[PDB]
From a paper:
Ricin contains an active A subunit (RTA) and a B subunit (RTB), which promotes retrograde transport into the endoplasmic reticulum (ER). RTA and Stx2A1 are ribosome inactivating proteins (RIPs), which remove a highly conserved adenine base (A4324 in rat) from the sarcin/ricin loop (SRL) of the 28S rRNA, leading to the inhibition of translation, ribotoxic stress, and apoptosis. We showed that RTA is recruited to the SRL by binding first to a conserved sequence at the C-terminal domain (CTD) of ribosomal P-stalk proteins.
The RTA-RU-NT-202, RTA-RU-NT-165, and RTA-RU-NT-192 structures were all determined at 1.8 Å. Moreover, the ethyl groups at the 2-position within the benzene rings from RU-NT-165 and RU-NT-192 formed distinct hydrophobic interactions with Leu207. The fluorine atom of the fluorobenzene ring in RU-NT-202 uniquely interacted with Val242 in RTA, while making closer contacts with Ile247 and Leu248. Additionally, in the RTA-RU-NT-165 and RTA-RU-NT-192 structures, the carboxylate group from one of the inhibitors formed a spurious salt bridge with Arg234 from the second RTA copy within the asymmetric unit. In RU-NT-165, the carboxylate being nearly coplanar with the thiophene spreads the charge across both the thiophene and the carboxylate, potentially reducing the ionic interactions with both Arg234 and Arg235 compared to RU-NT-192. RU-NT-165 had an EC50 value of 50 pM at 250 μM.
Residue numbers in the entry: 3 to 261
The structure:
């Protein structure tokens, strides 16, 4: 059983500081920091990456002292599957190289399951019966999401509730690692001790992460060939023409080309 780095977070007594330390620790295991373009770290190139460096693990615990372990791909910071008790569940891999890679995860588990659906928001929202804009985020939702993931192992969680719990976890871990802006959005929810759905500025940043990585890494000294439309909090659109405005906003990029 290959050993991958593990980062722990608990919703029991969660604070702005403890959540910040958590996301910073996840960023630090996802990248080396040796490849930066325009002050923005780039994730490792999937091509030639050894299997022993391919994944990191996030162990989540809640007030009920239930624990689940999420596996994240270091090449895109996204969850590929999770372990709860004696079972492990994996999203349907996009290719045969990824199918072979995930056989090295959670190998001491007695029961291995692969879903027919992938981890993308499009299908998860369909299984959940709700769009991201109608699924509240925060410490309360994460606490419930951890319990739902845990009890799927013994049939006590229905699939729509599982899918919604995946959407909560991916946004509060993967997307917060990718964007300081979203990290700050979860901080506000903890500061107010309030749960709320993400507003259009968050959703469009999530939808644009791949396009933003491409536009930045292809840019002529930071200047984009074509503008990228983003959304304000009130839903209105504005255009981004170069990398500078994004430096405080995006924290990780998928590898698109050599530096
Ligand atoms: C997420 C879009 C974005 C990208 C880069 C820089 C900024 C300031 C932003 C804004 C977030 C919210 C805004 C509002 O409500 O008008 S603009
Ligand atoms: Cl292994």
């Amino acid at each position: 059983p290959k050993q991958y780095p593990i980062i722990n977070f608990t919703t029991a007594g969660a604070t702005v500081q403890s959540y910040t330390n958590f996301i910073r620790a996840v960023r630090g295991r996802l990248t080396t920091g040796a490849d930066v373009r325009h002050e923005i770290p780039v994730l490792p190139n999937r091509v030639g990456l050894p299997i022993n460096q391919r994944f990191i693990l996030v162990e989540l615990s809640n007030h009920a002292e239930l624990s689940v372990t999420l596996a994240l791909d270091v090449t895109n910071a996204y969850v590929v599957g999770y372990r709860a008790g004696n079972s492990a569940y994996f999203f349907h891999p996009d290719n045969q190289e990824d199918a072979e890679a995930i056989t090295h995860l959670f190998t001491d588990v007695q029961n291995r399951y692969t879903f027919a659906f992938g981890g993308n928001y499009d299908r998860l929202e369909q299984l959940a019966g709700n769009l991201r804009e109608n699924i509240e985020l925060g410490n309360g939702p994460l606490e419930e999401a951890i319990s739902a993931l845990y009890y799927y192992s013994t049939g006590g969680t229905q699939l729509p509730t599982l899918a919604r719990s995946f959407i909560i976890c991916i946004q509060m871990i993967s997307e917060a690692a990718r964007f300081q802006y979203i990290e700050g959005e979860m901080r506000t929810r903890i500061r107010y001790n309030r749960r709320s759905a993400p507003d259009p500025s968050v959703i469009t940043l999530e939808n644009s992460w791949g396009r933003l990585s491409t536009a930045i890494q292809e840019s002529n000294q930071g200047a984009f060939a074509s503008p990228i439309q983003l959304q304000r909090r009130n839903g209105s659109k504005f255009s981004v023409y170069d990398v500078s405005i994004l430096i405080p906003i995006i924290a990780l990029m998928v590898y698109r080309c050599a530096p």
